Design a protein around this ligand. Structure first.
Ligand SMILES: [Ca+2]
Ligand SMILES: [Ca+2]
Lengths: 167, 167, 167, 167, 167, 167
């Protein structure tokens, strides 16, 4: 019997709540692009100025070890991978309570990329928990406190402070 | 007076729990790279075979309106932007309880990229809630049920079913 | 026993109050850049539009006598120096009480450079008192008055009147 | 109606005394150079060996927004600016009470540079208070103590400890 | 399960105390060179004449078996290794009580190199215990006496007595 | 009279315990090579596969000031020095509980080099204290806490975190 380990058992994390607002695609979204490797989905609820779209794509990874330093002797026979991308694009607007003529539009976009080796032992739950570990790096954990606590670092990183405060 | 709207007020969502494992950087992580715009951080807790790193980087965005279908209205403060990347790299290991000889290492990686315009009305909370909307696209929601229900997408997407099954 | 003199004992100065607002770095500032000779520190308290940073750098001076006219016979054996720079960068905003849409941002910057020979006899107090003499040149002293008084010349200098009014 | 803010209202500071020695230019200083944008002034009181000068210069700034991360909003009055420099040059002397033969001269110099945008709402007092904030960075402050306490940085910085010890 | 043995189980030792003076880097040191493979650190508290420095470097070992007597049939699958160097450089001064003009500076340098194979079973504790055994060779052990005793050997080796007394 | 100072009087350290396992050469070792400059010693108690060796060597240093920043006016009259090397070579074995046929041998090597000027004032105790300071750099010191504490740094450095946490 073969067993896969993520080797995160010895890491120190703090749970924190991150409540997702999941779309209702049937109500809100229509399909803009259905190419075999790339789908694009548009938000029908928006006015013409405001563009709200999502993009879901996969690419095949020739050599999953290509940029890693894992010794040849420990590489899987199957070296193929899959690369997933999930992009969301939003259009925000700025206006004034006092002046109905003041306004402009700001474009926001953000995406997630996930590079998964093609191996039978990797499961959907393993990958979601990987995503949870990933998104957890937008915070800093504090086990010093008696109830374990977390603090936000997204603004700090955006401002150029990329090293955590814990170091 | 001045108000920024994300124009999500007419989108239909469903909440779901996504509990993050935030790192205790003080225990686990040390700095491999401290250059001004790119920081690399390594996990002290892994053994020598396993490589566990995180990378935090920013890039300055020249014109946030350039690739977009949005373009800049006359009273916009700036075209400038900032692009943030957060990457996690893990080394998973497959072994066998039958054969001590049999084993290999799988490389996992994933990252998030966020493209924030330079407008002071964008707040740290606005950005985190944007990230929550983003990660929501790894799921599908149902308004219909009395407790709202959410199903998962990550498998179906990685398998090539890139259109939501709700559509 | 060796003695250093600054030779300012024969100069005529007027004390005047110049009350410094010193930062509380722990509360307000995070580190943007930690290069060995150049550190950059950002003000976490500001909104995204407003940039508030400080830069602290040192350069080594090959020949401290390189541009001076001190005779060779009176030069120290050790000709190395240190050059320190302290820059502050602020972003000011202009708005209107009456019109909540009227606004723009102005960039301010200013720095101090201190070129100190590497000599054991120069002390931290000597250098601070040098800085006090330096900043005192933004004023003009008046010993003619019975209580000695000072007047401001920063605007006059900015407007092109670089000679003091006393001459 | 029109108001300029320096956006320091949410920064945390601590006051400290910094008593300036302002020159009595009429007694001590005479003009060596009177060219329109650069004035050099020499200290009459020094003996022939010791050289004590001050230099006052302005340069016109083409685009004050050019090197900055700030850029110009549509209703800004001008891009123009002015850059002021104030330099002091002193000649310190080391002698020995044992040997009449032993002596040398150390050259000290330091200067301040101020980069003021061309907006009429910037006032002479705004600029002086900016200079006070600037010089404050030669210190570290503590909100904690009941009389606020400030420690010094100049030594630690010149020695290469460019990060504040509070951070 | 897999087990590593250092095979020191049956070898005979005598413990002796060797109390390390560990640096407080935050108070005493600054970074001179920040390279990915080689970091250099310097003591900013020393006076100018006395340069106290340290160097921390890693080279990567291609074949850890290259200069060993281990036949291939007994080697691990992975030949990778890393090589660590820790160098310290001090400057001692000799002077006189009776004569202020008499003195000179002596340079001391020393370094440690450690050549660790990349095997997950090698632990940080294993490596430190190896270092303790290494430094034990600067001594000679006697377990025949009622209290186990050790005599120092550094000066003897420096003076050409390289073979232990026991042998 | 003449006095040597290591100038470590004002530097800040934290003591930590490092108990050396000193060899009993008479029981465990034999001499492999007896040269005037290089002695090699081997563990005769190890089984045949496991080679445990040590090497003790001295080179003579022509100019101890060759790669130093000490100007000639500050050098001793004698430039002679000696250079000591102490190398240890071990062979660790990895095997399995479940499988008698599974195993390999890992080579460990490490050495120390010490570069001592020939000055009568350098004592054996001075040199051992220097070695203790050297090995202290494998740790990081914290004297702020109520008991002075130290954390290990060997694995962190091996894994590319070469700059101390404190810096
Ligand atoms: Ca660097
Ligand atoms: Ca003229």
């Amino acid at each position: 019997s073969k067993i896969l380990s993520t080797n995160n058992s010895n890491s120190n994390f703090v749970d924190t709540s991150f409540t997702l607002k999941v779309p209702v695609y049937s109500k809100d979204y229509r399909v803009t692009q259905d190419e075999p490797d790339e789908v694009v989905v548009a938000n029908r609820q928006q006015p013409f100025g405001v563009k709200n779209t999502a993009r879901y794509g996969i690419r095949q990874i020739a050599d999953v070890y290509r940029n890693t330093t894992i010794d040849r002797a420990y590489q899987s026979p199957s070296k193929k991978g899959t690369s997933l991308v999930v992009q969301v694009t939003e259009t925000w607007t700025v206006a004034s309570t006092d002046d109905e003529t003041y306004g402009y539009s700001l474009p926001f976009s953000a995406h997630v990329i996930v590079n998964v080796p093609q191996d039978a032992l990797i499961t959907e739950e393993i990958l979601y928990d990987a995503l949870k570990r990933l998104m957890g790096h937008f915070y800093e954990g504090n086990d010093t406190t008696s109830p374990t606590t977390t603090s936000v670092r997204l603004k700090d990183m955006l401002q150029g402070a990329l090293v955590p405060q814990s170091l």
